[PDB]
Structure formats: C-alpha cells, structure tokens
Amino acid sequence: DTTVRMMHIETDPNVLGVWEEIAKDFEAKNPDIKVNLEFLENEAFKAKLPTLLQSQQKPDLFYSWGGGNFQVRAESGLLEDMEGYSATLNQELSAAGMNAFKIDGKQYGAPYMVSQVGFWYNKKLFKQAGIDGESIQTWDEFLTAIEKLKAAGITPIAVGGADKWPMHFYWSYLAMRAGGQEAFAAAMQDQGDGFAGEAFVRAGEELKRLAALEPFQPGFMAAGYGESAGLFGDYKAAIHLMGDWDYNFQAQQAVDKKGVVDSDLGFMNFPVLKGGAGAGSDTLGGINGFAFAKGAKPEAAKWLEFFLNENSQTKLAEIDQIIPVAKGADKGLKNPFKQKISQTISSAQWHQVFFDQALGADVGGVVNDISVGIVNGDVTPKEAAEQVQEAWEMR
Numbered sequence: 001d002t003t004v005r006m007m008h009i010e011t012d013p014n015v016l017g018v019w020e021e022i023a024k025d026f027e028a029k030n031p032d033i034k035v036n037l038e039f040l041e042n043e044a045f046k047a048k049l050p051t052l053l054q055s056q057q058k059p060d061l062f063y064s065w066g067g068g069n070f071q072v073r074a075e076s077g078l079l080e081d082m083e084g085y086s087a088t089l090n091q092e093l094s095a096a097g098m099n100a101f102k103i104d105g106k107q108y109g110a111p112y113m114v115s116q117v118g119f120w121y122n123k124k125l126f127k128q129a130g131i132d133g134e135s136i137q138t139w140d141e142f143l144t145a146i147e148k149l150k151a152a153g154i155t156p157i158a159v160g161g162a163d164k165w166p167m168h169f170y171w172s173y174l175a176m177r178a179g180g181q182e183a184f185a186a187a188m189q190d191q192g193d194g195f196a197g198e199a200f201v202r203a204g205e206e207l208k209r210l211a212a213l214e215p216f217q218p219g220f221m222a223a224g225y226g227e228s229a230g231l232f233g234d235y236k237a238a239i240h241l242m243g244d245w246d247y248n249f250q251a252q253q254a255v256d257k258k259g260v261v262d263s264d265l266g267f268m269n270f271p272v273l274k275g276g277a278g279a280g281s282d283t284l285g286g287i288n289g290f291a292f293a294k295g296a297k298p299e300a301a302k303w304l305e306f307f308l309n310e311n312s313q314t315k316l317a318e319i320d321q322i323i324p325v326a327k328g329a330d331k332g333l334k335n336p337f338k339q340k341i342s343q344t345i346s347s348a349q350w351h352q353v354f355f356d357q358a359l360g361a362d363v364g365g366v367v368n369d370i371s372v373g374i375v376n377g378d379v380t381p382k383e384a385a386e387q388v389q390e391a392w393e394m395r
C-alpha cells in the first residue's frame with residue numbers, strides 16, 4: 001500500500017464531501033493506493049509552502065495558481081515531471097489547462113478549475129438605493145452607484161483588506177481596462193516605462209478616486225476574505241469583487257448559512273473605463289490546479305487522473321463550486337450565474353491570471369501592498385507603479 005498526499009486550501013463542506021466520495025471510490029477501485037487530503041488555509045498555505053517544499057514533509061501534490069511561483073519552482077528543481085504518467089490527463093482535461101502546467105516538455109501539474117473575478121452584488125440593496133445593476137457598464141456608472149448606496153446608508157463594498165489580494169483585484173482590473181492586453185504585455189517585458197506606465201498610474205488614480213468615496217466597511221483593513229464574504233452574505237454590504245468561488249463561500253460565511261439568495265443576487269463584469277484600451281470582455285481570473293512536488297510517486301498521477309475526471313468535475317460544477325476543466329463536465333454548469341460566467345471565460349480574448357500570482361510572491365506581494373497602500377494614502381499612484389516596475393525589473 002502507498003499513500004498519495006494532496007495539500008489543498010478548500011473549506012467548503014459540500015466540496016469536501018464530494019472530494020471524499022471521490023477518494024473513497026478511488027480507494028475501492030485501487031486497493032493499493034490511499035489518498036490523504038491535507039488542508040491548510042489559503043494565507044497560511046501560501047506563506048508556509050516554500051519551507052514545506054524544501055523539506056522532508058512535502059506532499060505529492062499541492063494546490064497551485066500556476067503563474068510566476070510555478071515557473072520558478074519548476075526551474076529550481078522543486079517539482080516532479082510526470083510526463084510519463086500523463087496520457088489520461090491529456091485525454092480528459094482541456095489542452096489549455098494541461099499546457100498551463102507544462103514547461104520545457106515536462107508536465108509538473110494538472111488543472112483543476114478556471115475562474116472569473118467579477119462583482120457579486122445584492123439586488124435587494126441596489127433596489128433600495130435606486131440602482132439597476134444591469135445598467136452599470138462604465139466605471140463612472142459604478143461610482144455613481146457607490147454614491148447612491150452611501151446615500152441610502154448602505155455600505156457599498158465589502159473588501160478583505162487585511163489579506164491585500166482582495167483589494168488588488170481593483171488595481172488589476174483598472175490597469176487592464178486602461179491599458180489593455182498590450183500595456184500588460186509591455187510591462188511584463190519591461191519595455192518602455194513598464195509597470196510604471198500610464199495605464200498603471202491610471203489604475204491607482206482610479207483606485208484612489210474610489211477610495212475617496214469611502215466605499216468600504218469600517219475596519220476593512222483588519223478584515224480578511226472570510227469576514228468580507230460574511231458581511232456580503234449577511235446583507236451588510238452591497239458589492240463584493242471576487243472570484244466565482246464566492247457564491248458558495250458567502251453562504252457558508254453568513255450567519256444563516258444561506259447568504260444572498262439567488263432572488264437577491266447579481267453578478268456583473270468589471271466595467272469599462274473611458275478612453276481605455278481594454279475591453280469589458282477581458283477577464284481577470286485564472287487556471288488553478290495541482291502541482292507535483294519533487295519526489296511525487298507515480299500513484300499521485302493515478303489519483304489525479306480520477307480526481308479530475310469528467311464525473312468528478314461534473315459533481316463539482318453541479319454544486320456550483322467550479323468552472324471545470326475536464327472535457328464534458330460543463331454539462332454540470334446548470335446554475336445560471338455559473339453558466340454565464342463560463343461563457344464569459346470562454347469568449348474572453350484576454351484571460352489574465354491574477355496579478356499577484358502572475359508576478360510571483362515578491363512582485364505580486366508588492367502589487368498587493370500598493371493596492372491597500374494607495375487606498376490608505378501610504379503611496380501615490382505614481383510611487384505604487386514605480387515600486388512594481390522596480391521589483392519586476394529586479395526579478
């Protein structure tokens with residue numbers, strides 16, 4: 001007998017019940033392979049992973065956003081090439097998802113889900129304030145909605161400021177809308193002014209403009225994602241900029257365990273910006289998966305083949321958690337919120353990975369720091385953009 005160890009960040013009880021049913025089924029079909037799921041909370045996982053990967057405590061598999069840390073971990077010899085065990089994975093999963101985890105002919109991981117960040121909103125609170133959420137197409141319209149919400153005495157936005165990344169979604173999206181894919185491409189290459197360019201300065205300027213409306217909950221800087229999601233679920237804030245995993249999370253974090261119910265819930269894409277080079281269809285999100293740590297056993301790929309299979313992924317789409325990567329599992333996307341989000345992801349010409357993840361722990365950490373820093377007045381838009389660029393050039 002051998003044990004496959006998979007480290008993950010999932011907290012949802014319905015997701016874990018599905019994962020455990022899949023593991024139980026796999027263990028019956030593979031009597032010599034056991035599966036151990038190892039939970040570590042998102043923030044703790046990101047901070048502790050570097051130590052874990054250099055140690056004897058490392059698992060076979062661990063959750064991954066791809067992006068910058070994945071590239072450096074692969075180059076540093078911290079991952080295991082499973083190309084010789086990837087045939088079924090390649091047959092059952094999206095080609096793009098598989099390619100996100102492949103480098104230099106080496107398959108270092110496999111995809112689990114794709115996601116979109118957008119504005120979840122409360123239709124009940126919007127109606128109270130006089131706002132038609134389906135009519136918010138522009139950033140100026142969004143800001144007008146913020147003012148209306150404030151006028152009605154409703155906290156406009158819930159944000160998990162303590163964790164930083166929930167605020168970075170604003171800076172990132174504004175940069176995307178101002179500059180388009182081309183400004184971002186130049187910035188990654190450090191061409192011209194790079195990340196210190198006009199679109200990134202504009203992003204901070206517009207973030208500062210939002211912040212000046214005081215749209216967040218009191219104490220937002222001490223709030224993590226869980227608190228922010230709870231506030232939205234408890235009808236105490238009208239808007240939550242977040243990935244699509246929030247649907248189930250806001251319900252779990254609500255005191256009533258239901259949150260904003262479907263009749264009261266809306267979702268909108270990030271709006272467009274006047275004079276911007278970006279399109280409203282461009283999406284921020286990503287392709288998340290599981291990476292193989294150096295030393296991973298072949299049985300880990302056998303587990304992954306089954307865990308990421310069509311039937312498995314169909315269940316996870318049916319419980320409204322993920323937009324799947326397994327071929328055919330999109331049949332599980334019956335919920336209209338998730339069905340629409342899946343079409344946006346598919347139609348997106350630019351599908352950008354979360355900036356913090358695209359840039360790696362250091363430079364992404366700077367983006368996270370400057371997002372809350374702009375809001376708090378620590379740095380100006382210009383200083384913020386310059387910091388990102390300088391850290392990126394050194395990387």
Ligand SMILES: O[C@@H]1[C@@H](O)[C@H](O[C@@H]2[C@@H](O)[C@H](O[C@@H]3[C@@H](O)[C@H](O)OC[C@H]3O)OC[C@H]2O)OC[C@H]1O
Nearest residue numbers: 009010011012042165225245249288354356357
């Ligand atoms: O760097 C962030 C990255 O941390 C973020 O990761 C999300 C993750 O938050 C989400 O998990 C939720 C848990 O945090 C929570 O404790 O329980 C509910 C979970 O849904 O899973 C999706 C990941 O992508 O993504 C955005 C990056 O900028």
